[PDB]
A paper describes a structure:
To probe the relative contributions of His227 and Tyr288 to Fe(III)-siderophore binding, site-directed mutagenesis was then used to replace the side chains of the two Fe(III)-coordinating amino acids with non-coordinating side chains of similar size. All five mutants (Y288F, H227L, H227A, H227L/Y288F, H227A/Y288F) were crystallized in their apo form, and all structures are closely similar to that of wild type CeuE. However while there is clear electron density for the Y288F mutation in its three structures, H227L and H227A are located in a flexible loop region and there is generally no electron density to confirm their presence. Mutants H227L and H227A gave Kd values of 22 ± 10 nM and 35 ± 14 nM, respectively, indicating only slightly weaker binding than for wild type, which indicates that the tyrosinate O-donor binds the Fe(III) cation more strongly than the histidine N-donor. The Λ-configuration signal was observed for mutants H227L and H227A, indicating that these do indeed bind Λ-Fe-5-Lic. The Λ-configuration was observed for all four, but with a decrease in signal amplitude compared to wild type, confirming the reduced binding affinity observed in the fluorescence quenching experiments.
The periplasmic binding protein (PBP) CeuE1 is an important component of the Fe(III) uptake system in Campylobacter jejuni, a commensal Gram-negative bacterium in the avian gut, but a common source of food poisoning in humans. CeuE, an integral part of the CeuBCDE ABC transporter of C. jejuni, is responsible for capturing Fe(III)-siderophore complexes in the periplasm for delivery to their respective inner membrane transporter. C. jejuni does not itself synthesize siderophores, but capitalizes on their secretion by other bacteria, such as E. coli.
Author numbering: 22 to 310
The structure:
């Protein structure tokens, strides 16, 4: 299990420990740079917009356009260190994608890591949200919203068919990669309890390289697709890679249960957001109800 965030109250500040290191963070930080889209959506849900001074503005998704005019510190992949320094923040918040930049960021300002543990997603989510809330004295409000998520999970789980199985795939222009439980797409299986066609795909971010022959052999009831063609802006789309007589014979094709998930949620991994996680849960529930 990933080490959680822990915090001791030191009067005007908290001494914070997480899986990357230790930081003294001021109470009520007023100049926050946020590189994780999910936690950015949690700042909105907690009414903390005016604490935010820098976001990855370049390809910000549709549900975070209230932050489109914040100073930019980057994009999905790139970080602008010069901009982050000029903003003179009191806190920087990162997740997994930016852990490679930890030491450089920490030279600028205290740097809090809100990692999502693929083996323990809900426990990491709740830890992340409540840790941010503690900084602002907003635990009450954060617990209410976490309860709302919990209730939506239980509603979705209660409609899941015990005997049907799903496959998760990530498409590129000419490539199909499968993902299973305890992946970064794993909440389908791990949180909502939809069964997997293959519970033994090996852990790791590349997933398993597959073809249509594999899809037919597995014969999934549902296929959840995360089309990376969309985030890059290429012409080939998953519907095309899947448009063949092998895929067409599957239960999922026959029952129109090839589900094209919005990659602005699933590929950008906005699970830390109190509203974006709800949107994702509802996206699955409505695909399988
Ligand atoms: Br820390
Ligand atoms: Br505007
Ligand atoms: Br993964």
């Amino acid at each position: 299990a990933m080490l959680p965030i822990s915090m001791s109250d030191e009067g005007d500040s908290f001494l914070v420990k997480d899986s990357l290191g230790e930081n003294k963070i001021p109470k009520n930080p007023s100049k926050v740079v946020i590189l994780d889209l999910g936690i950015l959506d949690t700042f909105d849900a907690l009414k903390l917009n005016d604490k935010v001074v820098g976001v990855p503005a370049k390809n910000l998704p549709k549900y975070l356009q209230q932050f489109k005019n914040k100073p930019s510190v980057g994009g999905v992949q790139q970080v602008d260190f010069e901009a982050i320094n000029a903003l003179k923040p009191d806190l920087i918040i990162i997740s997994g994608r930016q852990s490679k930049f930890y030491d450089k960021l920490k030279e600028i300002a205290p740097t809090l890591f809100v990692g999502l543990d693929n083996a323990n997603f809900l426990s990491s989510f709740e830890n992340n949200v409540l840790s941010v809330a503690k900084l602002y004295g907003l635990e009450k409000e954060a617990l209410e919203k976490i309860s709302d998520i919990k209730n939506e999970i239980e509603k979705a789980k209660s409609i899941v068919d015990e005997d049907k199985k799903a496959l998760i795939i990530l498409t590129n222009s000419n490539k199909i990669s499968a993902f299973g439980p305890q992946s970064r797409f794993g909440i389908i299986h791990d949180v909502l309890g939809i069964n997997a066609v293959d519970e033994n795909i090996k852990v790791g971010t590349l997933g398993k390289s597959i073809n249509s022959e594999f899809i037919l052999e597995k014969n999934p009831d549902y296929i959840f697709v995360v089309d990376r063609n969309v985030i890059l802006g290429n012409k080939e789309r998953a519907q095309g890679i899947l448009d063949n007589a092998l895929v067409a014979k599957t239960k999922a094709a026959q029952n129109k249960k090839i589900i094209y998930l919005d990659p602005e949620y699933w590929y950008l991994a906005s699970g830390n957001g109190l509203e974006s996680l709800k949107t994702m849960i509802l996206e699955i529930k409505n695909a399988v109800k």
